[PDB]
Design an enzyme around this catalytic site. Structure first.
Site, PDB file in Angstrom:
ATOM      1  N   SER D 139      -2.122   6.109   6.264  1.00  0.00           N
ATOM      2  CA  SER D 139      -1.934   5.933   7.711  1.00  0.00           C
ATOM      3  C   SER D 139      -1.925   7.288   8.363  1.00  0.00           C
ATOM      4  CB  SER D 139      -0.576   5.245   7.930  1.00  0.00           C
ATOM      5  OG  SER D 139      -0.190   5.207   9.243  1.00  0.00           O
ATOM      6  N   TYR D 152       8.866   3.435   6.852  1.00  0.00           N
ATOM      7  CA  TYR D 152       7.394   3.364   6.750  1.00  0.00           C
ATOM      8  C   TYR D 152       6.812   4.779   6.768  1.00  0.00           C
ATOM      9  CZ  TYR D 152       2.602   2.239   8.174  1.00  0.00           C
ATOM     10  OH  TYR D 152       1.228   2.071   8.195  1.00  0.00           O
TER      11      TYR D 152
END
Ligand SMILES: [Ca+2]
Ligand SMILES: [Ca+2]
Ligand SMILES: [Ca+2]
Ligand SMILES: [Ca+2]
Lengths: 242, 237, 241, 236
Positions: D139, D152
């Protein structure tokens, strides 16, 4: 006084942070995993500066319940202004052979403890409404890999990411969050030609930057990984001695 | 000990001069603009019991203009610290920017620091006692502006020169780093910035002082960002 | 046909980008600052793939006026979809002793040329209204220094900064701007133990990524420096050859 | 044929990686933690390209034993040349209120799975002696935080670190290890410089490139595909 707590303290960087902050007039808390005498040793040296020293066991083998020791330590000192999450010893294991429990143990000791301690400290700082500072001791290996310590590398990266996330999420509470990323630090000499400065660092050269981060001059600094490494990050195959 | 601030101003340059004067450094100042500000800074430095010497170093007359720093070092006797201060940001849309405008931003924002750093480093090598070179860059060493491509490119250039000098000068024990400010309030709320304010000049100068301390002796080759969380912000913020 | 122009071409990365893009259906423009005969050989090889090749001289010793050769080349090809700013030879010079004219010459050849070429290409892409791609060949030294090449390091950093700034500023025009940052490229296996993959890279291993950046698959990629380096950036002081 | 396995596959990036690698002639393995029906849809589409598709459940709620499903999938396909560790959905929780179980679940699903799958694939690639490729889908949050997804963010950073560590440690085996770091992917947006979400094929296209011979000099990197997301500072 302001109160600083050093978690997972040791005889090196963590002890030097405790002593330089005690000399700046902070009351000090220390958490220890297994080395109670080393924590008591540091506490006596802190008391010699005329500040309070309080210690507690924070057992990284018993998370998350074990982290509630930090709540008790904050209660005893009355407040917290600074949390320094000290880094433990580097554990190596070859990637291809590493047992899952050894992978998990490195994350438990090198990230999960810092997570739980940071959350307890931050909740107390929000309760006080006077801002605060969280300083994570990482490593150059937050940024560049070891060739034989994949779990250690990954966990230092994880603590780097947590540092950024806490910095952004807690900025509204005026809680400043940064990492200090040491290179190769001697924990007491021949030149070390592999490092541009040709020596290992001193524990004082890491603790000094932690002290600066606890000064009012550091009040605009958040979300950073400040690398103290004798040029380790500059090295590449055009430098590296053959 | 001697600290010289090049391309000084009434903001970060002045506050570096004053905090280093209070640590007992004799101070040199070069100016490219605001001579009267440099003179005001020197008067206030002298109030701290140390020397203040100033010269013009004209960034419109490179390279010969940089020899003013050799004259300033002669007058102060040595140099231990060079702080290359940053001038004002110049914006100009990319598609229509004149070539001379592009070149002028490199002249002011990296060629001056290059020539000043060479003169200082030669002097530090001659002294044999190491030294410190601190380049004031920007968050824009790292991340762009949408309307200041020359400024962005020159800040990146100064960041690369920082790394190169750090590695090349390391065996002379000359430590070379950048301090990369975000948005700083100068004499010259912001909800867009996570801390919701501009930085103070003293919050940049404080870190420059730390880099001049013995505690900073293991720090080289780095860009230390002082930005109120600017670098953290994205479209999800 | 789409048009790709490779500026400051050479018999290495620039030639291989021209040949692989010709094979993807691009008409090719070549500008040369050195090696005119190499440019003509590339053109002849490009035309064998059933596309056009046009060449001009673009003299980096005559900026800014010399950059106007790129306007003539774009006119002759009718459009530009892709500009690849190829990297010239690395120049080493000690920092303490470097002449100021040497410092400026490296910025002229390694940044100012790419700046003027990028402006000319981006203006034409904006007028076309169909988007475009600008790909700057930088170096690992966009990111990590040489020990003895401060000007080259600083100028590669500058071109990295210009890449990001052009990516942000041109984004409303759908002009995608990226850098490909090579390591040590041959212009073999186990010959170079200082590099983790233990060899130099091939020109094909840079040009292949340039080809990908010119595909529709790359339409969401902008502002990046894609490093192709055999693990050069990983080789810190703890790397054991 | 060469074999590519997509772990923790989904109906988005994971499916598109499988389909585009099947078009290049790779036999495909699929593991799923969620969306079994999506893994079956992917396999159905894969076999249209004249290659094998094999599926297993790899249950990230049962680690480490659950990861042995990848050993079974490798045995069935005969070899492995490419491992693509696909990313699961983003999970948010506020930092001050986050339970330790939430933190641990996110590390289990977003790092521990990729670690165990990477170890199994790398061991197989070493046994074969023919090199290989490991591609981690991370990401932009490998590099920059979310303001309200700290677990996360930390776990994506972790996987970025693991990518670099594996790249360096496995380099003598010619196992190339990289991350592809997507921005906001659809599976006008004025917050994003390119003013849209990315397409799953704009991620999978780069994964295919990383599986080509032209990518043979690329290792240890995180290739960001984000429509300019990373450029958008307070001055955008
Ligand atoms: Ca003692
Ligand atoms: Ca005058
Ligand atoms: Ca187009
Ligand atoms: Ca193979």
């Amino acid at each position: 006084a302001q109160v600083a707590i050093i978690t997972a303290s040791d005889s090196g960087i963590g002890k030097e942070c405790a002593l330089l902050l005690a000399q700046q007039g902070f009351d000090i808390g220390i958490t220890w995993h297994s080395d109670e005498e080393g924590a008591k040793d540091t506490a006596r040296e802190v008391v010699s500066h005329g500040v309070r020293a309080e210690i507690v066991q924070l057992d990284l083998g018993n998370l998350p319940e074990g982290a509630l020791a930090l709540e008790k330590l904050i209660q005893r000192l009355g407040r917290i202004d600074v949390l320094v999450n000290n880094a433990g010893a580097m554990t190596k294991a070859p990637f291809l052979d590493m047992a899952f429990d050894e992978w998990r143990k490195i994350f438990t000791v090198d990230v999960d403890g810092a997570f739980l301690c940071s959350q307890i400290a931050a909740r107390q700082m929000v309760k006080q409404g006077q801002g605060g500072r969280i300083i994570n001791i990482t490593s150059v290996h937050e940024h560049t890999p070891l060739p034989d310590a994949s779990a250690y590398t990954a966990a230092k990266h994880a603590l780097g990411g947590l540092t950024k996330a806490m910095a952004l999420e807690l900025v509204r509470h005026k809680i400043l969050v940064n990492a200090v990323a040491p290179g190769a630090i001697a924990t007491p000499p021949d030149a070390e030609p592999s490092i541009p400065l040709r020596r290992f660092g001193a524990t004082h050269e890491i603790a000094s930057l932690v002290v600066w981060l606890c000064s009012e001059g550091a009040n605009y600094t958040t979300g950073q990984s400040l690398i103290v490494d004798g040029g380790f990050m500059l090295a590449n195959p055009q430098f590296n001695p053959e």
